[PDB]
Assembly symmetry: D2
Homo-oligomer: 221 residues x 4
């Protein structure tokens, strides 16, 4: 196991929390970002995670987080971009909400990846994993702005895989975040399924530029 830590952003979210806890259990040092002090952050601190405040809603918050991260570590085993914000398209607030989702889903991973490249290449095996949403396959009549920002994130996978090769592998996981009768398998998944996707990507040596779909066959249903 690497002694360089893994960063998981937005790890008070259900999926992020499970992944962070399992990485700690596996033996990784883990740094998390959080935007609200909560019982889940306490759970993470008690489990061994380093908890850094990160408000990814605007450029200045992203850069403040980056500065904090660099004080904390000079190497990273991986960055897992899990931070996610779903907002309603509330009338009169559509632009604000779309910009906020752009900031969380696209601006923050781009800036963190760009600024954190030297931390990742200080590690012998280095990975970026972008966690998006399987809604991008079809689009979303309801959640237009949300979906477009997750699609932008999936583009960053292809582009950073190209730029950062060969030293850093860059991949995605696209979970059906909503998640029963609309999937093929018809079962209720635990977050464990996302952790197993993450482990597959981290432990691989020959996989980059790819995105894992984790959606119980919703697309064939």
């Amino acid at each position: 196991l690497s002694s360089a830590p893994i960063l998981i952003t937005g790890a008070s979210q259900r999926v992020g929390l499970h992944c962070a806890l399992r990485l700690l259990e596996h033996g990784h040092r883990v740094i998390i970002s959080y935007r609200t002090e909560h019982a889940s952050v306490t759970e993470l601190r008690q489990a061994g995670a380093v908890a850094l405040y990160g408000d990814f809603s605007c450029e200045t918050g992203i850069m403040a987080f980056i500065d904090l991260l660099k004080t904390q570590t000079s190497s990273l085993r991986a960055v897992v971009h899990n931070a996610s914000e779903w907002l309603a398209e509330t009338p009169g607030e559509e632009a604000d909400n779309f910009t906020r989702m752009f900031s969380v889903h696209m601006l923050a991973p781009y800036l963190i990846n760009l600024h954190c490249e030297p931390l990742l290449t200080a590690s012998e095996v280095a990975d970026i994993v972008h966690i998006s949403d399987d809604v991008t396959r079809k689009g979303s009549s309801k959640h237009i702005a949300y979906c477009a920002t997750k699609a932008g994130l999936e583009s960053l996978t292809l582009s950073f895989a190209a730029r950062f090769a060969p030293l850093v592998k860059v991949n995605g996981i696209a979970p059906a975040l909503l998640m029963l009768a609309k999937s093929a398998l018809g079962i209720e998944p635990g977050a464990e399924v996302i952790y197993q996707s993450l482990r597959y990507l981290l432990d691989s040596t020959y996989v980059t530029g790819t995105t894992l779909t984790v959606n119980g066959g919703r697309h064939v249903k």
Copy 2:
């Protein structure tokens, strides 16, 4: 009867498309961000020219307000406005946000706010002009590519929301060219694509790739 809006029509591709639409008898409104001989050419050819700064939310909403004073109906909206910026060190966030605003925020707000203008037309279309770069991604133009990918998402999503009254489609040109075929493309290929989409009754949620077979070469 209703006009077709083409945004950013001082750009090479947009100028050609607007002129060709006028030649084909359409009424045309263009947006422009810079007074230029190409904008004079469009006014002289018959286009109504509206200023539009899509670099920020306030510019986008000011343009929407202006458009709505100009017309109560639209035959179509062609989102052609595009800005390619370098990833200059220290300006990456500003440039990414600006391209987000032009390529994603603007089409989304214009589409949302202009839906009643389009539905006032018997046949109504939205066309998003992206960039074939999204297929592969770009090591060099990461932010640009990502904003164009977001635009392509808007095609699927608005095609769904605006059914059955507004058809929503895309064209993805290899805007670097403006390849397997090894010819130099004129903007006419983009206009032919636009005509196919406008003239179809059926087609929605699709994106036409105009790239000279780059992806097979």
Copy 3:
């Protein structure tokens, strides 16, 4: 002014496209699997009507020979011939093979053997008509869908091999296997777009009423 070949064109969509091409002023060759009133309609309209049995290599090579007696050039080949067969128990392999023969073997052999006819024309196209079913797959029509997916791969590969002299593209219409017309006309307009384009190769046009967003 070189002729356009459209295969399997007593099928309603092929019939429509052939007739529209003739009205547009093209010389048109059609293939047909069985003699039928619409074949005489096509003859009457100006089409050069040729028998083509795409069931097996022999039938396909017979057709290619026959074609090459008619013309030394082609403006385009439109692979429209399509056969849907049920997955009848005990006949699944025979039916899968037959659909492979019509949808994959025939376009492959025709393209390979007719490349010189196409390169004799200043502008040359191949258009593969598949079926929009390939995007999602089909629980029921597994074999049919797989053969249509194989045909779509031929677009990419022949586009690469035949560049720059022949443009190779697809049209993937929805519900083609359910056809007994806006649908046929949208296919014709897609064909016209492809034939008339100058910078488009390796692509597949989806024609499906927005089914994939619905």
Copy 4:
């Protein structure tokens, strides 16, 4: 205790995957075309080695019958059998038909006729091993590529049909001049070993919420 079938296990990838599965403690049945040292090795490691000729319907159906005399259940079927043939002048149709038989007809009939063996197992998987060439197409290997693309369609379609009881997924690996060129065209600049495909297989077998997907195992050739 239900066995995993890997077809075409003389091949380099299938051989490795079969050996690793046996090492992991699974029972394994393999198919083979010809006797080879690799078949002896598989037998010695504990594989049940069955003859199978996937060149035509008769041979495929004979293999299915033979499998049914060997086991009343399957944990998984991994369709690894693959045939690459040159587009030899005057043999194009023969070769395209043969590759259709191995890559499309065989997995189709095997899946259709062996579904009951799979549903005898509590967790059941079908895995289609295709080839990453399908993404771009191939100027050279047109027929081969088209048969591999047909196989990838079978993933989507059997995933729909066989849900919820059987998960159906694919692995699309980047299967001398050709190697040198392909490596330079990969992003990671590594030559892969078959272990990369075994890890993909383990991910699919061990997952619970994944069906209808295809894993791309290609060193980032598509982004370079």
